[PDB]
Amino acid sequence: MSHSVKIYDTCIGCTQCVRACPTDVLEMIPWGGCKAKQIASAPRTEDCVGCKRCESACPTDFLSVRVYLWHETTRSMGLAY
Amino acid sequence: ELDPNTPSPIFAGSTGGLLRKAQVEEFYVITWESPKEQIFEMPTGGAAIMREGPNLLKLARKEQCLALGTRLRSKYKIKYQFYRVFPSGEVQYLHPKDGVYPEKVNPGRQGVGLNMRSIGKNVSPIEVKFTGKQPYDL
Amino acid sequence: LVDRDPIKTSFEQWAKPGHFSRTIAKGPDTTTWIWNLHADAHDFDSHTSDLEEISRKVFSAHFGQLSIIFLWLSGMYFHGARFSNYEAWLNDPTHIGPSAQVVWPIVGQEILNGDVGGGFRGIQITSGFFQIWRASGITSELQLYCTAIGALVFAGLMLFAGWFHYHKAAPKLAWFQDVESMLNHHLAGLLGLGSLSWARHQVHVSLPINQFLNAGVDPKEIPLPHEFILNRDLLAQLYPSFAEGATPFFTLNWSKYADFLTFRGGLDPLTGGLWLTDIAHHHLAIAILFLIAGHMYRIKDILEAHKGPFTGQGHKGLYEILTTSWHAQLSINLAMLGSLTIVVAQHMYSMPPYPYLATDYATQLSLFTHHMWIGGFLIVGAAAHAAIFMVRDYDPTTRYNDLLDRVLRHRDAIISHLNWVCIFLGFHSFGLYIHNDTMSALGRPQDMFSDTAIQLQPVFAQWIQNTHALAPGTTAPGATASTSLTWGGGDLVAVGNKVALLPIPLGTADFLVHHIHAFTIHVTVLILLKGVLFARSSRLIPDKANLGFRFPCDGPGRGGTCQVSAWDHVFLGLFWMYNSISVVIFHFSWKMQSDVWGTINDQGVVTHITAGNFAQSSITINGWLRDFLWAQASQVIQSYGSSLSAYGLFFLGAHFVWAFSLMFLFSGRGYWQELIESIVWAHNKLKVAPATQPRALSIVQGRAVGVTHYLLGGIATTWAFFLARIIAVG
Amino acid sequence: GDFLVHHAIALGLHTTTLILVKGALDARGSKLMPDKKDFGYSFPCDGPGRGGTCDISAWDDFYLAVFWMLNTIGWVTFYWHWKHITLWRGNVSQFNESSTYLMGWLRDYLWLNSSQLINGITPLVCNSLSVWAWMFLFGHLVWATGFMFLISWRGYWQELIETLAWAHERTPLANLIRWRDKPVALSIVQARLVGLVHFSVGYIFTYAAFLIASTSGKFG
Amino acid sequence: DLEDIANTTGQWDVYGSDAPSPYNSLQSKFFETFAAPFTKRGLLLKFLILGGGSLLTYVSANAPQDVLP
Amino acid sequence: KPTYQVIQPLNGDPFIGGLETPVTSSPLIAWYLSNLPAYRTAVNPLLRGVEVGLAHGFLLVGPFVKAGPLRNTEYAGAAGSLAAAGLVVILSMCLTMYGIASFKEGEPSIAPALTLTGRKKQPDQLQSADGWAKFTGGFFFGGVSGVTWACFLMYVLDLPYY
Numbered sequence A: 001m002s003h004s005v006k007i008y009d010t011c012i013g014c015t016q017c018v019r020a021c022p023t024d025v026l027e028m029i030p031w032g033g034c035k036a037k038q039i040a041s042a043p044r045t046e047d048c049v050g051c052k053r054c055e056s057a058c059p060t061d062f063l064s065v066r067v068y069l070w071h072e073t074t075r076s077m078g079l080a081y
Numbered sequence B: 001e002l003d004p005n006t007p008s009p010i011f012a013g014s015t016g017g018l019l020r021k022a023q024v025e026e027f028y029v030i031t032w033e034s035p036k037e038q039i040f041e042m043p044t045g046g047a048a049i050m051r052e053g054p055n056l057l058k059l060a061r062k063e064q065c066l067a068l069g070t071r072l073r074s075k076y077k078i079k080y081q082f083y084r085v086f087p088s089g090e091v092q093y094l095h096p097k098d099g100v101y102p103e104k105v106n107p108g109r110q111g112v113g114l115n116m117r118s119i120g121k122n123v124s125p126i127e128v129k130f131t132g133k134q135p136y137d138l
Numbered sequence C: 001l002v003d004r005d006p007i008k009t010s011f012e013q014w015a016k017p018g019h020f021s022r023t024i025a026k027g028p029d030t031t032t033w034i035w036n037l038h039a040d041a042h043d044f045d046s047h048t049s050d051l052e053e054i055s056r057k058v059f060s061a062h063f064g065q066l067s068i069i070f071l072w073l074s075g076m077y078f079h080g081a082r083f084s085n086y087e088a089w090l091n092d093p094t095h096i097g098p099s100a101q102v103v104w105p106i107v108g109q110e111i112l113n114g115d116v117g118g119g120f121r122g123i124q125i126t127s128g129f130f131q132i133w134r135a136s137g138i139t140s141e142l143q144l145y146c147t148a149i150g151a152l153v154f155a156g157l158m159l160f161a162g163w164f165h166y167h168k169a170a171p172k173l174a175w176f177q178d179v180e181s182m183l184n185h186h187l188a189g190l191l192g193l194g195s196l197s198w199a200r201h202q203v204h205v206s207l208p209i210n211q212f213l214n215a216g217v218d219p220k221e222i223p224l225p226h227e228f229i230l231n232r233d234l235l236a237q238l239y240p241s242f243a244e245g246a247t248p249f250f251t252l253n254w255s256k257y258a259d260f261l262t263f264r265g266g267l268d269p270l271t272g273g274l275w276l277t278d279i280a281h282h283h284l285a286i287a288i289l290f291l292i293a294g295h296m297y298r299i300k301d302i303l304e305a306h307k308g309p310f311t312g313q314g315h316k317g318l319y320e321i322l323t324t325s326w327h328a329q330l331s332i333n334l335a336m337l338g339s340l341t342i343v344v345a346q347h348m349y350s351m352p353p354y355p356y357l358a359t360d361y362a363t364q365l366s367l368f369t370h371h372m373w374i375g376g377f378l379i380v381g382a383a384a385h386a387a388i389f390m391v392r393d394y395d396p397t398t399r400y401n402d403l404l405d406r407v408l409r410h411r412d413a414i415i416s417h418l419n420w421v422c423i424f425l426g427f428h429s430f431g432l433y434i435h436n437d438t439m440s441a442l443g444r445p446q447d448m449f450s451d452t453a454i455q456l457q458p459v460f461a462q463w464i465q466n467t468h469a470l471a472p473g474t475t476a477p478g479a480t481a482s483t484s485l486t487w488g489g490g491d492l493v494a495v496g497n498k499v500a501l502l503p504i505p506l507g508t509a510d511f512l513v514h515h516i517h518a519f520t521i522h523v524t525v526l527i528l529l530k531g532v533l534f535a536r537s538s539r540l541i542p543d544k545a546n547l548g549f550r551f552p553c554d555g556p557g558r559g560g561t562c563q564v565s566a567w568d569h570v571f572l573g574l575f576w577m578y579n580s581i582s583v584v585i586f587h588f589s590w591k592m593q594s595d596v597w598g599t600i601n602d603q604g605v606v607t608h609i610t611a612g613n614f615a616q617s618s619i620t621i622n623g624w625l626r627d628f629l630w631a632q633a634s635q636v637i638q639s640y641g642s643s644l645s646a647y648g649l650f651f652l653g654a655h656f657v658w659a660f661s662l663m664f665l666f667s668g669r670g671y672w673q674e675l676i677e678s679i680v681w682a683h684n685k686l687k688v689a690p691a692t693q694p695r696a697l698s699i700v701q702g703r704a705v706g707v708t709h710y711l712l713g714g715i716a717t718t719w720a721f722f723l724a725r726i727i728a729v730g
Numbered sequence D: 001g002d003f004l005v006h007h008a009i010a011l012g013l014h015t016t017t018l019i020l021v022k023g024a025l026d027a028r029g030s031k032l033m034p035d036k037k038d039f040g041y042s043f044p045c046d047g048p049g050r051g052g053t054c055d056i057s058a059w060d061d062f063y064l065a066v067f068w069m070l071n072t073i074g075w076v077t078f079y080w081h082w083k084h085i086t087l088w089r090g091n092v093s094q095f096n097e098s099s100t101y102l103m104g105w106l107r108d109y110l111w112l113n114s115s116q117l118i119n120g121i122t123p124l125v126c127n128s129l130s131v132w133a134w135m136f137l138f139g140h141l142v143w144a145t146g147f148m149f150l151i152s153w154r155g156y157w158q159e160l161i162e163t164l165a166w167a168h169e170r171t172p173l174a175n176l177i178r179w180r181d182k183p184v185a186l187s188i189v190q191a192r193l194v195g196l197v198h199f200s201v202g203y204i205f206t207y208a209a210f211l212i213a214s215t216s217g218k219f220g
Numbered sequence E: 001d002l003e004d005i006a007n008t009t010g011q012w013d014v015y016g017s018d019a020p021s022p023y024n025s026l027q028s029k030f031f032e033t034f035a036a037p038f039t040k041r042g043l044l045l046k047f048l049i050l051g052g053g054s055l056l057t058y059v060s061a062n063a064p065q066d067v068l069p
Numbered sequence F: 001k002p003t004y005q006v007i008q009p010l011n012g013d014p015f016i017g018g019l020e021t022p023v024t025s026s027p028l029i030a031w032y033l034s035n036l037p038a039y040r041t042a043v044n045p046l047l048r049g050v051e052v053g054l055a056h057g058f059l060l061v062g063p064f065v066k067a068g069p070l071r072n073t074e075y076a077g078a079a080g081s082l083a084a085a086g087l088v089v090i091l092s093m094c095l096t097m098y099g100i101a102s103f104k105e106g107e108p109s110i111a112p113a114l115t116l117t118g119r120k121k122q123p124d125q126l127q128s129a130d131g132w133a134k135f136t137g138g139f140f141f142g143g144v145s146g147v148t149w150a151c152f153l154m155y156v157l158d159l160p161y162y
């Protein structure tokens, strides 16, 4: 929020797990101890659309994200044109 | 254009990409390397070739110009590179910045992941009534 | 997979959880894979990544259709035999009203079995055997009982050719991956050698054995089981044993003849099923072509040839991959096979090819709507499977820069036009009717669009109809009447029970349905066209060939990002076509009875099943339930306690099943989940559920159980609505 | 005849409420969507995967509810009238042996007792009622035209508007000419509404015109 | 080389974006202010939407002896 | 000279669309449209206003005088004006409150000529509100007016027609 859909999990390891999703997710930001030690839920999200391709793969064990952002640009929906 | 003709990524026609809203606002464009003359797939439906120059195709919107990867890395190459063009300059240096390949470590940048309290028992609904004096603007 | 092989088991795989994509059906239990397994059971992205087999399966699992169509037909010939009515109906046509099926009087049953003709209890027919069957240069009940087992023969054998493929160690590539000859053969001698062969058993035997049937007798007071050999002596009544000719050519003399044929056109007074004296000639004159024609050829060459400026450079090379596709060379076909079925649907009703049709009303409209739903149900398909091409079939991209790569080049374009086409239509193609209501309910006819108010004046006539029934005066030789009696000029006298065909007039109330068709046929196709075209990539999703041509919907973002895909363009494209056909049907019978079907008596004062109510009153789209739906259907809602009754008694179910589709069509998904657990809970308390994780419907399965229902619902509704307003008056 | 409708108004507020009770009894969340909140109500849709997730906002069950409140409040009203109708300028035996079944509920009532209205635009001039029957077909359209919204789902609509907004921009005598609002296809909750708020008037404007257009001659 | 015709008049060529017609007929400032009031447009339109549209509808609906609906 | 211009998708780069075929950019057509607001803004929008108002003017007659609500009129106030001197009016401010999507407030007067224009970045806007007034002001006196030498013209008519 402005893009706020929680995909977080607990491993945040990203090998044979999850990568897919247009730009949005430049992570691998190792928090001082979480197994394959790369963590959190996002980077700077003011860039791309609203997928849930976000999970589909690699756990969120709870919810998984979708549209919830409301405040919604245009570069945030393909169509500002 | 022509009097300045600086091309690289061969095509011919198409009713696909770039139209009015890429001048009047933002621009978005991808660049790359390659070995020897090879025929590609394309966003916007079409299909052409390569060889070199800058290898610098311009693209409507940035979800469009990374898909050169979602197939254009099932066709060899470390190097592919898209930036952000305006109608005047910068701020938003798109694939520029620091390191590259979303899955390494130099810095941490943004992200966070938590809100106030974590995924735990938010059976707790919406709290205070939104009022200008208690840390809920994040 | 083992089990274990390669090479080194005969021991077959019966037992060990799964198969079909590789973290497969997993050990861990679930339900979804039980609609999986049946759905996509036939598919090819799995079985193997290597063509080879697949064509070796489809040439077998094919087979078991012919064999089936073959077990079918048999129970129809048998059925159309000992469960008789055919013997009885034929000495006695114009009179009977045929049957083949009968119940057995268990429970309520029997009402369904109501006196049908040659003196017996049964349920009627709108499936014109009893009329192909006119043929029988022979007649006899037990005989059809040979043609019947002759059917089961072709089957078991034309079903052990299917063992004698895939399961037997199979052919390979070259065999089909040399295409070089295929049509050469097919069209030449079967397309040819049938039509040809059919000629020889279409004057030999049939013509004579209805040349002197169209009068009286009772069979076996005619046509023995052998009688028609060397005995070219009864062939004497129906032309010479060539007298002095020798194998056509010309040094021939006619002071008074010209072999059988002697071309007709019109309709037998006593059996207006179109003349047979022709029916040989036309099939003969076919075959020749095919006989000559299937003699091309070996393949590129011809297509690797004509290009131009804007034309198709890739025309040249229009697919190596047309020996390497299927999903392509099936989709093409369905458009034709399909579009070449509903062209039947006309040449039938405006030119009957069997003895006793038209007079038989109900036993050739059933037809013209059954044949009508295939020349439609096979077309949306003919798009689906192109989408299945457009997405995947080939290995890589070896296909390049051509006719297609061309069409796609424009694509936000071919479909940019076509769109406006539709809203131009629709406005000129439906609100057109709505005018009438809004202004006939306002009520000022001066200004409607009536066949009489908006300027058109007591004539339609001058177009091309009137230069068709009048054309036997061109290069045309001739032969009394036309080609199709329903044409403008001349003639009347057609039939002595009821009626058949006559002119069929037009103008408006024929003008504008004919146009709603346009707009209906067009916006159908928009959605399929744009659907198959944008199959793999787009500026809503470009990362959009990444699974398959289905996929539910990409995801809540981009605004919507739901329907997209092309399973679904072939889901909302059915949804229309159900109309496309469903309103074309609505057209024919309201015409064909409002005018045409009706009846002669003295001074042949014609009396249509409805004195042309159409006139000023289909133009109002309420008249379409004033004059249609509420008028006719009074026979469906009166139908209780009768003999047909099974229609009114369907007409509630299936007029229910449709109104059950919306539930499957209109609803969420984690919904029936959220629900399915409340359930699953109550289940666990007694200790009664978990094993085989019960799950809701697979987003797109849900759509699969829309649509399919919405159709078998919304359709049989009329299948009932119909058979109930041609049986009994009409 | 009354020992059935009376058990079919009962199958309404029960089903209608298993969905509203449910709809309600977790706008909070559940197994498929555990943390379904901070916004609860109308978040319509979620990404594919998990099992496949959809109209699983407490709104879209409300959304889903309103169909059976439009099916109870139909069986119930339907019932009075047929009864009343018959119980007036005529019999009552009518509802008696001819409401104990189903076909007949369609035939005599539904099919009997419309008569008056529809041959009211009649090929033979505007007679007594004309507002009503035109309403009644306005009734059948507003309804049907729900369905789009309802079997269409923003994805297909947006995309050809992507092609259909390559027009203007690429066509003369209609260039420069700027919109101030960017051509898009309806929100992924919005159309579940509008098909409905559409399904409804059609439906509720049809009986409106139906009963009146037949309790007015009558007979009864 | 005869059909090497040195491009029978080059043209120059590309006429131009240059100049294949003069311009607009001299009829103009024969309307200078003629019909102003949208050529005094300096705050208006509210005026022409009570005025014009109360006289496309005031007398437009009323009538002295029906010729009815 | 070539196969079709020096063979090109667009003016130049093939990553904009337009797919310049014919029906797009044949000197056969592109000239039948540039004394007017196609490629270049001649004089201001001032005058183009009435050739636009007027031409579009004496249209909308037979459309609502020969397809009129109760048609083929025997009223001396039809076969012309009648009402339709309403469409031009219902749309001669269907426009003005679109020129509120244009403001940009100036007064240069450059309908006289200087140095072979371009208006350069002439695309996008670069026609302010005090322009779109003098056009949709030319529209009213082009609409209303252009409706009367329709009406005023007697009607010597060709007809039938089959």
Ligand code: CLA
Binding pocket: C012, C056, C057, C058, C060, C061, C063, C064, C068, C159, C160, C161, C162, C163, C166, C167
């Ligand atoms: C008596 C014999 C027999 C046996 C034991 C087998 C055994 C086998 N066949 Mg097989 N096959 C047979 C006869 C037999 N076949 C015949 C006669 C044909 C041609 C008609 C084929 C064509 C065939 C193909 C193309 C394939 C196999 C394959 C296989 C293997 C998988 C079988 C399976 O589970 O399919 C289960 C299906 C059935 C048991 C039913 C078969 C369907 C047809 C013939 C009849 C059913 C239609 C029926 C009217 C249902 C619709 C109506 C419904 C409403 C009732 C297995 C070793 C497959 C293989 O090699 O592995 C990938 C391969 O796909 N077969």
Ligand code: CLA
Binding pocket: C038, C039, C040, C041, C042, C043, C044, C330, C334, C377, C378, C379, C380, C381, C382, C384, C385, C388, C567, C570, C708, C712
């Ligand atoms: C010549 C053609 C023919 C052939 C050989 C095929 C072959 C194929 N099609 Mg296909 N198709 C066709 C015509 C054909 N199609 C047409 C005309 C259409 C348009 C409607 C389609 C639309 C279509 C779609 C959308 C899909 C396919 C797919 C496929 C593939 C999957 C087959 C499968 O698993 O069975 C599927 C059959 C079943 C699961 C049986 C269920 C049938 C139900 C719906 C019953 C129908 C109602 C009926 C009245 C009920 C029986 C009576 C009952 C009341 C008692 C296969 C290669 C699928 C694919 O993914 O490609 C790889 C994809 O799903 N087809």
Ligand code: CLA
Binding pocket: C649, C650, C651, C652, C653, C654, C655, C656, C657, C658, C659, D067, D068, D070, D071, D102, D103, D106
């Ligand atoms: C479950 C629900 C409830 C019930 C009981 C019904 C019932 C009905 N709705 Mg309905 N509806 C509902 C909720 C319900 N609806 C809701 C919530 C909505 C949305 C608001 C609708 C919207 C709706 C519409 C738009 C329509 C209906 C219609 C109908 C009726 C069809 C006529 C009929 O079935 O005659 C009863 C007689 C029979 C069923 C005889 C059956 C005998 C045959 C089929 C053979 C025996 C069965 C055998 C197994 C079948 C052979 C299959 C074999 C191969 C196995 C039926 C009474 C339709 C209607 O007719 O008028 C409105 C109309 O289309 N409904």
Ligand code: CLA
Binding pocket: C419, C420, C422, C423, C424, C425, C426, C427, C430, C431, C434, C519, C523, C524, C526, C527, C572, C573, C575, D141, D144, D145, D146, D147, D148, D151, D152
């Ligand atoms: C009765 C129906 C309703 C209506 C009016 C429409 C209309 C349309 N559908 Mg559609 N559709 C519907 C139900 C409806 N649908 C349903 C229920 C489904 C699925 C269940 C679909 C699935 C579907 C698909 C997949 C597609 C369409 C498309 C279309 C458009 C086709 C082009 C056209 O002719 O439109 C214009 C004409 C009309 C809408 C009919 C005339 C309307 C009359 C009443 C005139 C009114 C105008 C007047 C000025 C009113 C102003 C007065 C003032 C008081 C407001 C059209 C907008 C397609 C498309 O967009 O292609 C262009 C696309 O293919 N539909």
Ligand SMILES: CCCCCCCCCCCCO[C@H]1O[C@H](CO)[C@@H](O[C@H]2O[C@H](CO)[C@@H](O)[C@H](O)[C@H]2O)[C@H](O)[C@H]1O
Binding pocket: C492, C493, C603, C604, C605, C606
């Ligand atoms: C239905 C609306 C009428 C508009 C079309 C009318 C124009 C043509 C006139 C009638 C058309 C029907 O054609 C019909 O004419 C006569 C009816 O009087 C009938 O006349 C028939 O009956 C008699 C018996 O020998 C003789 O007068 C005729 O030789 C014979 O053809 C015919 O069965 C049919 O040819």
Ligand SMILES: CC1=C(C/C=C(\C)CCC[C@H](C)CCC[C@@H](C)CCCC(C)C)C(=O)c2ccccc2C1=O
Binding pocket: C663, C664, C665, C666, C667, C668, C669, C672, C695, C696, C697, C698, C699, C701, C702, C703
């Ligand atoms: C109603 C509905 C459901 C719920 C429908 C369900 C759960 C149907 C599945 C029921 C199955 C077929 C019952 C099977 C049980 C029996 C086969 C087991 C006993 C065996 C027999 C002897 C009875 C969805 O899952 C769904 C999904 C996506 C979009 C719309 C909808 C939708 O509208």
Ligand SMILES: CC1=C(C/C=C(\C)CCC[C@H](C)CCC[C@@H](C)CCCC(C)C)C(=O)c2ccccc2C1=O
Binding pocket: D148, D149, D150, D152, D153, D154, D155, D157, D158, D184, D185, D186, D187, D188, D191, D192
């Ligand atoms: C047609 C259609 C569209 C396309 C959007 C369209 C067609 C909007 C078209 C605007 C119409 C023409 C406006 C006419 C409505 C008037 C009554 C004016 C409304 C006034 C309001 C302020 C009340 C969707 O975006 C959509 C999204 C999700 C599910 C289904 C669909 C769907 O069926």
Ligand code: SF4
Binding pocket: A007, A008, A009, A010, A011, A012, A013, A014, A017, A018, A038, A039, A040, A057, A058, A059, A060
């Ligand atoms: S893979 Fe999914 S941490 Fe793991 S669930 Fe979070 S992004 Fe990586």
Ligand code: SF4
Binding pocket: A020, A021, A022, A023, A024, A025, A045, A048, A049, A050, A051, A052, A053, A054, A055, A065, C557
């Ligand atoms: S899930 Fe959201 S953030 Fe992640 S890629 Fe998709 S849109 Fe971007």
